[PDB]
Amino acid sequence: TWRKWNVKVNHNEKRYATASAIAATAVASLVLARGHRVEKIPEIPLVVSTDL
């Protein structure tokens, strides 16, 4: 059980990967190249009023 089950990852760098992950939520052809029938959404980033 003392097999390493976990990995330490630089913090700064990890924010790098978060930053990028958000960025791809924009380009709107990455939203397709993953999954996501999005073709009928009105606009991207799809932004809905706070009222939700």
Partner: protein
């Protein structure tokens, strides 16, 4: 995504597949489901605005202490626009056939 929960999360918690995250966190595993980029986000209006506070731009500083978003190695991502530019195309000898002609 949202910013401050006024009671959304309970509405969506049941409905299949849908899932929310406060902006203060943004779970990578829910942005990039398997390292295939691009979750499909519905930001809300407040959170979208929060999103400068969180990360920060040339004006608003950080809120994640001592941080800045990454730089760029290129200036501009799309390359062909460099190469098919008039600004290179005047520096370079002319072209070939792109499919040569079998000799002998």
């Amino acid at each position: 995504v949202y910013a401050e929960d006024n009671g959304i999360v309970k509405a969506l918690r049941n409905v299949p597949g849908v899932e929310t995250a406060n902006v203060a966190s943004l779970n990578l595993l829910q942005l990039a489901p398997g390292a295939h980029l691009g979750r499909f986000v519905i930001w809300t209006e407040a959170a979208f605005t929060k999103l400068d506070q969180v990360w920060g731009s040339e004006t608003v500083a950080s809120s994640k202490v001592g941080y800045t978003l990454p730089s760029h190695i290129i200036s501009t991502s799309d390359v062909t626009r460099i190469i098919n530019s008039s600004e290179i195309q005047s520096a370079i000898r002319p072209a070939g056939q792109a499919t040569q002609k079998r000799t002998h």
